[PDB]
Write a protein that binds this DNA or RNA. Structure first.
Lengths: 96, 108, 81, 94, 94, 108, 96, 81
DNA sequence: TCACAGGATGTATATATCTGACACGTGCCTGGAGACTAGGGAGTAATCCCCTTGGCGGTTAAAACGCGGGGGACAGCGCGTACGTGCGTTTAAGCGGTGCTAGAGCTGTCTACGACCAATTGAGCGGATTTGCATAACAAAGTCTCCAGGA
DNA sequence: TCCTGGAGACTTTGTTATGCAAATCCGCTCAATTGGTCGTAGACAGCTCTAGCACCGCTTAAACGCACGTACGCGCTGTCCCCCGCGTTTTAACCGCCAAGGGGATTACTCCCTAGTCTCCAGGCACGTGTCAGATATATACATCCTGTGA
């Protein structure tokens, strides 16, 4: 048998996804999430294909930046694993 | 009757001047715009444009291409901390991110 | 429709975290992440809809989204604007 | 049909001055158009206020110059000012 | 002699209609003046842009109304909208 | 001849209307200002003004005062969640801070 | 003899300083600092007394907010004592 | 003028930290704090002076400071605005 | 271990006092309001046709699930030192003057400056061809893990 | 202990043919330039007066610095269970395709709403005058917390 140990693969995924530019999320599920939310303000709304794409990129950019700060918070606590509270700290520092 | 002539030629610029003059007139920035106003501004926008493109072209070369794509713009901007700041709140469509891995996460 | 928050699957969350340099993820992150994402979307969509309604339209365009994002301290390039 | 304005022509040209053998994607161009529009608005916006605060109706190269310094990093600000200074000085002589 | 304009008169009255037995320090008044100017500029600024985005020259009660929502939290926004609606509805009706 | 009056009277407002019409007009916020625009806005400013003063008046009484000072305005703004957004980054001279002591620092 | 214990005095100070509204930084030292910095850009520069105060209040407000965020970072790491790290982390999370 | 950065004495640093809810301060904070204070102060002065120069004047007024602060997301009330 | 005493300490409450920061009054001058015209901006209806919504079938990565085992999270314990408290001793910041004048602020005059209009036309735009770059496929060569024993 | 070295898996390098996105050409407006005028914001000189700078002397609160002791931060260890990596199975997302019509974008008319004008007067401003809520100093009473004995 042959395999890699935990921690080896995770690093590779970091490398690769940092490198690439495409979306790391699925589309049809996202489109629907946008609408599920949008209908709460108004029914019978429509979207251009470019409008959804704009939302996705803004969302990913937001979350990725959040994860960087989350990761730093975890490191500050001498950890590798991120916890919900590391997210919460970063957000609060930013005034959210 | 003199021949009509583009102001951009006079200033040695590639960016349009007369248009900028118009844009300055509107957008409700002011009641009036000075003659040298759009000229000064056109030069500035052109300068900054060159800086990004130059670095982007170098970034493109580093990836062995003959063309600039949004990703090259992303890397080129960040590699110059002056622009990183100016555009420190700009999301680039398909920019990706820098390949930064924290040292404490590395195996050893 | 419904239940599209679950539409943000686990692998997707991981991958986003990875760009952030996150190596290792606790099992409680996924739910917290979703709550955070939702708030972001609600704020952006709500503002985009507001612009769309002002213009007396039904279809939300890229510009409506771009303007909505901008004023939250985030400028998006490439979709116009 | 209606007509549009953009900077795609001028961006293309500038690219040649720095990299004569390099082309550009339509997407990169989309980015460059957003960039130019963004910077334009900021300078015009700040210059507007300088005139407002100093009780003036006209925007001149000065309000732009000052606005540039308040918006740009020190290094970029210097090069930008030098280029603006010339463009005006020359335009006047021309 | 030169002159100035402020909102100190109006702020004073509004207090009286709420707490008839209290006064305002000179600083608290100065703060309220900065407050009014701040909110005013944001609404006027956003309303300006809405007209710009929609290719229009005239600001009406709607550009303001939309700006009010974008700037205020939903709870304050609606109360402000109700009051704005009446002031105009009445004015045009009187 | 009809007798002149202020529009703030007509609109049932305390804030000046004719002035706002002017202020909206200038500063180059727009080319033009509609008749109902100044009125709508004056009402909005008046509403927000009242809310702050009302809350501050209560803050003043918590200190057994009959007068509002900068501090009372601070407390009013921060205790009210919405005002703490609208004015979330406003620095107020002599505002002081809320008495926020983290539980983990408390003796035991 | 009589003494107050470690941390008991500090708590009273926290309360009082949160409560009062007066400036904590001395005026003349601050004014001089403003000029010491300003002169590096321009000689023969002058200030209105109100300008100096405006700068001072902004400066205190900035540092006070910084310290609160710093404090939270230390707490997140299970500490009471704040270190330079906690200042740096809080700022970095805010993109400074 | 020199070394007025030390004019921000330990007690001043402590008290500012206390207002922020800080109970306990390591000995390395004092030096770090001054560095951070300075950068903030310097940036504000620079913008204020720039405005002063534009207006062709020598004395900086409160309004130049207010504008300098404001644009950094720091609206200041009580000094005019 | 645990509570309670009390002792000292610090904070809160009541009183008198007085003073200067507010509330209110007077007179005066632009700026807001009537009553008026003239002209383009916005509103409306009518039209085209582009883009979104919706559904279909088939193919295929991408998510779900569950298992097994090691790495990191967590809790407890011991060491020593870096901070906090409080005393006594320096020091320099407020405070309340005093006097000088440099620069801010307002007035009045004259000018070149930018807005405006009307005529003329080439820079830029959209849309139609062109072709070479980037893409995807495929096999080989090089780089980086992770054991299983040995020096 | 740790170091091969070998087996293995995964990334990079180098071919190869193909498709469509980007580069360039063609023909058509209408925004940019010319070349005049007109009226006024901006530059300048001048003068008046306020606010900032400098200096002085004295009180004293606040900043230095030292010494003693203690909770705190840190390193180290030891369970244990939660998250990783892998293979097997199931699900829903893409891709390409086709049809229908709703709504975005367009023009062409109409008027009515607002800019711009003169005239008039009173609401808001600066500047005085009067007062009383808040600041000072002081005594007084009430909470709270540290260390000690005694259960």
């Amino acid at each position: 048998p042959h395999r890699y140990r935990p921690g080896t693969v995770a690093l590779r995924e970091i490398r690769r996804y940092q490198k690439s530019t495409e979306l790391l999320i699925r589309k049809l599920p996202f489109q629907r999430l946008v609408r599920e939310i949008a209908q709460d303000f108004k029914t019978d709304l429509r979207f251009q294909s470019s409008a959804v794409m704009a939302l996705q990129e803004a969302c990913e950019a937001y979350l990725v930046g959040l994860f960087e700060d989350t990761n730093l918070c975890a490191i500050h606590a001498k950890r590798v694993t991120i916890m919900p509270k590391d997210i919460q700290l970063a957000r609060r520092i930013r005034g959210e | 009757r003199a021949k009509a002539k583009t102001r951009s030629s006079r200033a040695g610029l590639q960016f349009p001047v007369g248009r900028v003059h118009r844009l300055l007139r509107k957008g409700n920035y002011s009641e009036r715009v000075g003659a040298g106003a759009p000229v000064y501004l056109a030069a500035v926008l052109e300068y900054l444009t060159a800086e990004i493109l130059e670095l982007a072209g170098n970034a493109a070369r580093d990836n062995k291409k003959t063309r600039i794509i949004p990703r090259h713009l992303q890397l080129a901007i960040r590699n110059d901390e002056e622009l990183n700041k100016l555009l420190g709140r700009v999301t680039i469509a398909q920019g990706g991110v820098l390949p930064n891995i924290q040292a404490v996460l590395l195996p050893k | 429709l419904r239940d599209n928050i679950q539409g943000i699957t686990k692998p997707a969350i991981r991958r986003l975290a990875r760009r952030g340099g996150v190596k290792r993820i606790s099992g409680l992150i996924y739910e917290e992440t979703r709550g955070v994402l939702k708030v972001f979307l609600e704020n952006v969509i709500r503002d985009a809809v507001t612009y769309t309604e002002h213009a007396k339209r039904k279809t939300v365009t890229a510009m409506d989204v771009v303007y909505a994002l901008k004023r939250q301290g985030r400028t998006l390039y490439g979709f116009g604007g | 049909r209606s007509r549009k304005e953009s900077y795609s022509i001028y961006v293309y040209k500038v690219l040649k001055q720095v990299h004569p053998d390099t082309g550009i994607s339509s997407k990169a161009m989309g980015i460059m158009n957003s960039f130019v529009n963004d910077i334009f608005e900021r300078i015009a916006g700040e210059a507007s206020r300088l005139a407002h605060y100093n009780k003036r109706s006209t925007i001149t190269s000065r309000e732009i110059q000052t606005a540039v310094r308040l918006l740009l990093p020190g290094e970029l600000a210097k090069h930008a000012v030098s280029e603006g200074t010339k463009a005006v000085t020359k335009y006047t002589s021309a």
